[PDB]
Design an enzyme around this catalytic site. Structure first.
Site, short mmCIF file in Angstrom:
data_model
loop_
_atom_site.label_atom_id
_atom_site.label_comp_id
_atom_site.label_asym_id
_atom_site.label_seq_id
_atom_site.Cartn_x
_atom_site.Cartn_y
_atom_site.Cartn_z
N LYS A 58 -15.49 -1.69 0.44
CA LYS A 58 -16.19 -0.40 0.57
C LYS A 58 -17.70 -0.56 0.77
O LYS A 58 -18.32 0.25 1.47
CB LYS A 58 -15.91 0.49 -0.66
CG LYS A 58 -14.43 0.82 -0.85
CD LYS A 58 -14.24 1.78 -2.03
CE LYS A 58 -12.77 2.06 -2.26
NZ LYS A 58 -12.60 2.87 -3.51
N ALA A 86 -20.53 0.45 -14.56
CA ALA A 86 -21.72 0.76 -13.79
C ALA A 86 -21.67 0.17 -12.40
O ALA A 86 -22.71 -0.17 -11.83
CB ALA A 86 -22.97 0.28 -14.52
N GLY A 87 -20.48 0.06 -11.83
CA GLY A 87 -20.35 -0.50 -10.50
C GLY A 87 -20.30 0.55 -9.40
O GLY A 87 -20.69 1.71 -9.59
N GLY A 88 -19.82 0.13 -8.24
CA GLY A 88 -19.62 1.06 -7.14
C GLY A 88 -18.66 2.17 -7.51
O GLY A 88 -18.78 3.29 -7.01
N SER A 102 -0.70 4.06 0.86
CA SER A 102 -1.42 4.98 1.75
C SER A 102 -0.63 5.39 3.01
O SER A 102 -0.72 6.55 3.42
CB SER A 102 -2.79 4.39 2.16
OG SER A 102 -3.71 4.47 1.08
N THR A 127 -23.96 -4.40 -19.56
CA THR A 127 -25.38 -4.61 -19.37
C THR A 127 -26.02 -3.27 -19.09
O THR A 127 -25.78 -2.65 -18.04
CB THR A 127 -25.68 -5.60 -18.22
OG1 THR A 127 -25.34 -5.00 -16.97
CG2 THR A 127 -24.87 -6.86 -18.40
N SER A 167 0.80 -1.22 0.00
CA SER A 167 0.00 0.00 0.00
C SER A 167 0.84 1.27 0.00
O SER A 167 1.84 1.35 0.71
CB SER A 167 -0.92 0.02 1.22
OG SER A 167 -1.71 1.20 1.19
#
Length: 274
Positions: free
Chosen positions: A64, A127-129, A16, A152, A14
């Protein structure tokens, strides 16, 4: 001393901890930031354990949505996103979820890269999160149109339904897309493995259209390569979004806004090392 973590799996590599440690040095904040490996099926348990003593944490994919379900309270933008990437413990001990991904994306696009959104034609792929987390702050910039296109179409139609009241957002199948747009944002996870959608070459007007991948890697992503070959005016990956979503979370926690420019500079220097 206040403790913060990044929740993830895997989380060994990471960026972060470096990012927030540099933020903390910049802004004189007395805090520590570490990684926390959550088993893929035990995130909520891990978060509850950490927040006995901890102050806040960032939440990475794939956690998330679970973080969104765990929280005692949600900010309005986290509510709309259906996903939490930033957890904070409040004074009464409750757990609040925010989402800084959309803020990070739009800040990187408009401030760092100098890309105008107001009055422009925007296309987002997926079209996801990842898409749901950025629609509101994009629409706040008042584009002429925001088209969501996905494998879709029904998933895109559902997203457009949720944000219809916030602006000119519409869903479309790929077969109807042909006219060039001003900005194309890629939000498809599967694209890293080469599953690009059946998008026409004509969507990119050479020297005009900006292409932005929410994904990033050490090397240009498949979407970025596609955009570059078609002569997009600017081609960006998600590194600036990473830095800006982190800076926004830092501000949510500490109340001071850090400078992302020298932090991005260090991240890019480390990428150059390879």
């Amino acid at each position: 001393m206040d403790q913060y973590v990044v929740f993830g799996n895997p989380i060994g590599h990471s960026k972060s901890p470096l990012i927030h440690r540099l933020f903390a040095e910049q802004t004189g904040q007395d805090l520590e930031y570490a990684t926390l490996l959550a088993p893929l099926d035990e995130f909520s348990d891990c978060a509850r354990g950490f927040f006995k003593q901890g102050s806040g944490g960032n939440v990475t994919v794939p956690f998330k949505e679970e973080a969104f379900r765990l929280c005692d309270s949600l900010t309005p933008r986290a509510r709309r996103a259906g996903a939490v990437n930033t957890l904070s413990k409040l004074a009464d001990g409750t757990l609040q979820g925010d989402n800084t991904d959309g803020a990070g994306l739009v800040r990187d696009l408009t401030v760092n890269a100098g890309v105008e959104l107001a009055g422009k034609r925007i296309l987002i792929l997926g079209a996801g999160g990842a898409v749901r987390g950025v629609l509101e702050p994009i629409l706040a910039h008042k584009p002429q149109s925001l088209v969501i296109a996905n494998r879709t179409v029904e998933k895109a139609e559902q997203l457009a339904r949720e944000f219809d009241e916030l602006g000119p957002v519409v869903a479309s199948g790929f077969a109807w897309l042909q006219e060039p747009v001003d900005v194309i944002i890629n939000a498809t996870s599967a694209s890293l493995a080469g599953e690009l959608p059946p998008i026409a070459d004509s969507l990119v007007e050479a020297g005009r259209t900006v292409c932005y991948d929410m994904m990033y890697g050490k090397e240009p992503t498949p979407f970025c390569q596609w955009a570059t070959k078609l002569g997009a005016a600017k081609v960006l990956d998600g590194l600036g979004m990473l830095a800006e979503q982190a800076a926004e979370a830092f501000f949510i926690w500490r109340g001071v806004r850090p400078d992302t420019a020298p932090v991005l500079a260090e991240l890019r220097r480390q990428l150059a090392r390879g």
